[PDB]
Write a protein that binds this ligand. Sequence first.
Ligand SMILES: Nc1ncnc2c1ncn2[C@@H]1O[C@H](CSCC[C@H](N)C(=O)O)[C@@H](O)[C@H]1O
Lengths: 265, 265
Amino acid sequence: MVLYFIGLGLYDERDITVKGLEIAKKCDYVFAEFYTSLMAGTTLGRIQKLIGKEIRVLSREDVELNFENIVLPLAKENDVAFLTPGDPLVATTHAELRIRAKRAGVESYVIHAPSIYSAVGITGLHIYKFGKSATVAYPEGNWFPTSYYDVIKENAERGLHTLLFLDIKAEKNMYMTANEAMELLLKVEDMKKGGVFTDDTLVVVLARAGSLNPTIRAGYVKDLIREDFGDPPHILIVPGKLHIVEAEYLVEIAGAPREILRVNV
Amino acid sequence: MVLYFIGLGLYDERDITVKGLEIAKKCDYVFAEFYTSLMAGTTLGRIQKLIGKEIRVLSREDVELNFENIVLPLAKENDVAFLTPGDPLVATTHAELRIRAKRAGVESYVIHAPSIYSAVGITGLHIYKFGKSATVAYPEGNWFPTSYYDVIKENAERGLHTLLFLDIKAEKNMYMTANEAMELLLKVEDMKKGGVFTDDTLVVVLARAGSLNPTIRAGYVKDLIREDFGDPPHILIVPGKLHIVEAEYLVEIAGAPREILRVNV
Ligand SMILES: Nc1ncnc2c1ncn2[C@@H]1O[C@H](CSCC[C@H](N)C(=O)O)[C@@H](O)[C@H]1O
């Protein structure tokens, strides 16, 4: 008996690691959630075909409120796998599920998969230069989230890049675009007026990482705010001070304005 | 006409993604580099057997000085794969290779795989709370680098965690242990006296991420400095203030002392 947390990766069913696949194929029961992220290059059917098992999809409520009632019971007498997009423990609250497993007397194992958190390396920005990360959440009712703005401010003051996860409402089939995130940031800027995010701010957009042809674009907010970056998911990055080689890659690979090559040391 | 940058993942030969494996199998030539890091849980022979292709290993010089003479010429008229440990382009020097490909008229695509940068999520520490990353380098001769100490200081004062990559002499298959890293940090503290790393500092050690049996341990330096964390590779993390959920995971999963629930939250 055992419970495996297995990541499926960034874009399609083949982003799962060989290790994850060989283990999932031999499990007795397979569960999964698809609300923490969007795998734009595959379908439940294609994933089921690859693993050769029927997959029971769980909702956020099933997991957060009933993981110990739906999954763990079976894990006490069978080999069970719980699949998630990307890496199962990145930008999710699934780590806490391992504590539930322990209390239920179930041993758990984690199988990693490519995560957007490290895939941003394809933007050419040095991974070690990324600071604190944040999530741009959709405003709801009278509540308008703004914490992500302070994160950018804090990182930028230290010359660090800021990775911005974008909101997702899987049940409503809503996936926040980089465009919508930029619009929200501009509104927060008008409020706090910190000079953190304006029309002249350089940003980087990465869409559908994991696919063979992801959209990688760099430029000023005023020019990219209404640009079509293709289907979701999207992630937005606000670079800090750039190293020359970072600027070169942004220009050569992400189509950034050649003027950024002239860094102000 | 195509060059594929393919990540091998975290630890052994099954950490490559299904996508990376199937693409590599289809390539006419397969190259690999093991100087940015090593794949401690496998061997070149096992990787070759899995891919079913002869693998030409390239040294740091082969790549940095002659990538365009060794790899690109073949990629100009064949499908070529370039394997790297972890996730491609996380290593800072990798990105520029895509520019070389472009200059040579060769198309390049990136096939991601798990990176230690994202795998640290298995420590229970929230990914968004990680700040700037650093590498602990062995001192030598009259050179005593200490920039990694400053990184911890700046992250911690902002309540952020610090991921510390440990020194590796790939060519010599030699790894710096978390124990050695802690001893070095205590030495730096004795020199700078910034109150950044002491016997009372809480640290987290993650060894052999990617394995089904990684070592995940959390506790105070005074107690972990001489503890055996198993075979390499080791990663050291100096958490910033903890969210109670992070602390509870460290206690339940990483064997942290109950004391962290009142001292580090
Ligand atoms: N392939 C992809 N391309 C671009 N952004 C992606 C992405 N996959 C995830 N994201 C981003 O991350 C958000 C989900 S956060 C959950 C991330 C997941 N555990 C992982 O390891 O990747 C999305 O709303 C989106 O903004």
